[PDB]
């Protein structure tokens, strides 16, 4: 047993972290709201960017893995938490979106720890 200034390759991170991202995409219908960037104009919520200073969604995180924009695995993890925190901050606790956020966050919390241990 062993509970674990380092640099990983894009291929190393995709092999390790894409299966965790795919686990999120497979949660249906819970992932549908997180697949594309929030569009305040389409959704008629011009107050969105007054609460969320830094947008995040699954499509953005998929591009970053796919184009080698992550170098340490904690860079991927922070973006995913940014996505869930944004959603938890902006939406009311009673809304379907907040509860969808909570299910995704559970599913992420219960798979990322082992994956980190393997890197
Ligand atoms: C695939 O097209 C998208 C479907 C979800 C649509 N959507 C919708 C639409 C509008 C309506 F509120 C609604 O019920 N939507 C909705 C549509 C499909 C769903 F599966 C779902 F859970 C919700 N609401 C969204 C909310 C968010 C959101 C997130 C994530 N964090 O803060 C906010 C605000 C994001 C997307 C939302 C936008 C288009």
UniProtKB/Swiss-Prot annotation:
UniProt-annotated location(s): Cytoplasm; Nucleus
Free-text description of this protein's post-translational modifications in UniProt: Methylation of the KIX domain by CARM1 blocks association with CREB. This results in the blockade of CREB signaling, and in activation of apoptotic response. Sumoylation negatively regulates transcriptional activity via the recruitment of DAAX.
Domain Bromo: 8-115
Residue span of region Interaction with histone: 47-93
Effect noted on mutating residue 106 to R: Abolishes interaction with ASF1A
Interaction with ASF1A as annotated region, ranges: 85-103
Coiled-coil zones: none
Complex and partners: Found in a complex containing NCOA2; NCOA3; IKKA; IKKB and IKBKG. Probably part of a complex with HIF1A and EP300. Interacts with GATA1; the interaction results in acetylation and enhancement of transcriptional activity of GATA1. Interacts with MAF and ZCCHC12. Interacts with DAXX; the interaction is dependent on CBP sumoylation and results in suppression of the transcriptional activity via recruitment of HDAC2 to DAXX. Interacts with phosphorylated CREB1. Interacts with CITED4 (C-terminal region). Interacts (via the TAZ-type 1 domain) with HIF1A. (Microbial infection) Interacts with HTLV-1 Tax, p30II and HBZ.
Function: Acetylates histones, giving a specific tag for transcriptional activation. Mediates acetylation of histone H3 at 'Lys-18' and 'Lys-27' (H3K18ac and H3K27ac, respectively). Also acetylates non-histone proteins, like DDX21, FBL, IRF2, MAFG, NCOA3, POLR1E/PAF53 and FOXO1. Binds specifically to phosphorylated CREB and enhances its transcriptional activity toward cAMP-responsive genes. Acts as a coactivator of ALX1. Acts as a circadian transcriptional coactivator which enhances the activity of the circadian transcriptional activators: NPAS2-BMAL1 and CLOCK-BMAL1 heterodimers.
Implicated disorder: Chromosomal aberrations involving CREBBP may be a cause of acute myeloid leukemias. Translocation t(8;16)(p11;p13) with KAT6A; translocation t(11;16)(q23;p13.3) with KMT2A/MLL1; translocation t(10;16)(q22;p13) with KAT6B. KAT6A-CREBBP may induce leukemia by inhibiting RUNX1-mediated transcription. Rubinstein-Taybi syndrome 1: A disorder characterized by craniofacial abnormalities, postnatal growth deficiency, broad thumbs, broad big toes, intellectual disability and a propensity for development of malignancies.
Stated name of the protein: CREB-binding protein
Gene: CREBBP
Boundaries of the shown chain within the full protein: 1082 to 1196 of 2442
